[PDB]
Amino acid sequence: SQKPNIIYIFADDLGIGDLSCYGATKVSTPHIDRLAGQGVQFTNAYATSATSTPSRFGLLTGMYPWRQENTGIAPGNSELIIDTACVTMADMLKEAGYATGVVGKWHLGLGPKGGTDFNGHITPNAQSIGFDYEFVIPATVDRVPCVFVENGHVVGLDPNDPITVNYEHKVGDWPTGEENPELVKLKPSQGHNNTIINGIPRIGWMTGGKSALWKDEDIADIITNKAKSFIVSHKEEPFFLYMGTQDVHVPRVPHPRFAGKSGLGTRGDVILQLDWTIGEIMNTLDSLQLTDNTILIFTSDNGPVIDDGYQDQAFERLNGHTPMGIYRGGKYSAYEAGTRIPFIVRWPAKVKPNKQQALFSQIDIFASLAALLKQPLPEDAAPDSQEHLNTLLGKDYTSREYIVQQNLNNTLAIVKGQWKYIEPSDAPAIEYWTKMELGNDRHPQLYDLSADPSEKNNVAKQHPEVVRELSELLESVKTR
Ligand SMILES: CC(=O)N[C@@H]1[C@@H](O)[C@@H](O)[C@@H](COS(=O)(=O)O)O[C@H]1O
Ligand SMILES: [Ca+2]
């Protein structure tokens, strides 16, 4: 064929150390390892951000999320965060002649100023920014409402039982973690004490849509089947599938057939469920003879977290597993494990198996696919996205000049050749809930990653001219 199919899969909070192809010894990921073996495994690939909403925003817009105020972790009832006049990756692939679909985790908002009204046609939605087809989890599985949205309508919604959602105060009289601990089956470790759904207290309050409520143990199966439907439906045409798994995000509710199979508790169990999901996508492609001329990109939105809010024994069951690999920090953090993510590109027709050590950022995927397809961008489109197609395909080992990282508190860090600079911040050093090291410091930090990849040795006092140059460089990206 001329024009490859494109599948982009965000895992949720999957760590640079969670996969056996990245050296995990305490858990085995044979489907994802097989994918690695068939394509290009990246060892220096980064998301824009150490959290969900901003990394997904940066990927789809080709604009750094920290250039817009509303791009932080979004509530389940956030208005759509991407302006409908923005050119998205989905829009440019639609212009390039692809059928476009989003399946799974969205977390970019739905509906207009005021927040999501879940009770009729929800607009603007993913279809307002270049997706033909939409089947989404509004935000995260730990956030209300716990329902799916398909082409702008809640699946199984009864108009006589309308939904209301509120993140400021209780609406309705549904049990909560706070008031009704007797009805809590998975106890919260950190907040998560609002409306209970299926015995799991969630973030935010909801009432109504009883018949629309999902079953947590079926979410991977539902996402996997809707992804396969989309692929089977577009067997004969060029398609783009943007897919977001729930795994390995809290609450971790493995299907019974994975539950207790890892021996790392539910956190390990959903790594195996995730590996099985990617296996199902690879088997579907193979079935339809679409393997060879499909670009399959598998990555994560941000780094990993052990205890992210439920008493699921993820620390107690960890068994010497290292989700962060050697790296400092994790989810939320400006330290490397915040934005360092697993990243695999398989395109058998065109791309030989390889390890890509080059510096790569998810911000460049938009301009890199546009360049591949020779698709022209409006002057204002994908403004921070550089063409690095050769690097993406393992055809060159040319690093990005620098990459930019954003933590929870919008502290930015820049990596240039061997050097990592973290700009000063007044935000807390330690994240209140998880106690994660955020890398917020009133003083500059400088790490030589070639010598000190675990960021053990701040050498800012040793290299003021390096701090000054990288500081001036980061400020010029900000004011560009
Ligand atoms: C105490 C608490 O509420 N913690 C939650 C965490 O559980 C998770 O839901 C996170 C977003 O994760 S992300 O991957 O979608 O950014 O938001 C935090 O606020
Ligand atoms: Ca995430």
Author numbering: 32 to 206, 207G, 208 to 511
Article excerpt on this structure:
BT3333-S1_156S-sulf also contains an SpII signal peptide but whole-cell assays, using GalNAc6S, indicate that BT3333-S1_156S-sulf is periplasmic. The structure of BT3333-S1_156S-sulf was solved in complex with GalNAc6S and displays a pocket topology. The 0 subsite is made up primarily of polar interactions. The axial O4 of the GalNAc (the unique difference of Gal versus Glc-configured substrates, the latter having an equatorial O4) coordinates with Oδ2 of D173 and NH1 of R174 (for further interactions see Supplementary discussion). R174 also coordinates with O1 and the endocyclic ring oxygen through NH2 whilst O3 interacts with the Nε2 of H225A. The active site of BT3333-S1_156S-sulf reveals the specificity determinants for Gal over Glc-configured substrates when compared with the GlcNAc6S sulfatase BT4656-S1-116S-sulf.
Here we report how a core PUL has evolved to metabolise the complexity and heterogeneity of CS-A, CS-C, DS and HA. Crystal structures of the two PUL-encoded carbohydrate sulfatases provide key insights into substrate recognition by these critical, and therapeutically relevant, enzymes. PULCS/DS/HA encodes two O sulfatases belonging to the sulfatase subfamilies S1_27 and S1_15, the endo 4S sulfatase BT3349-S1_274S-sulf and the exo-acting 6S sulfatase BT3333-S1_156S-sulf, as classified by the sulfatlas database.
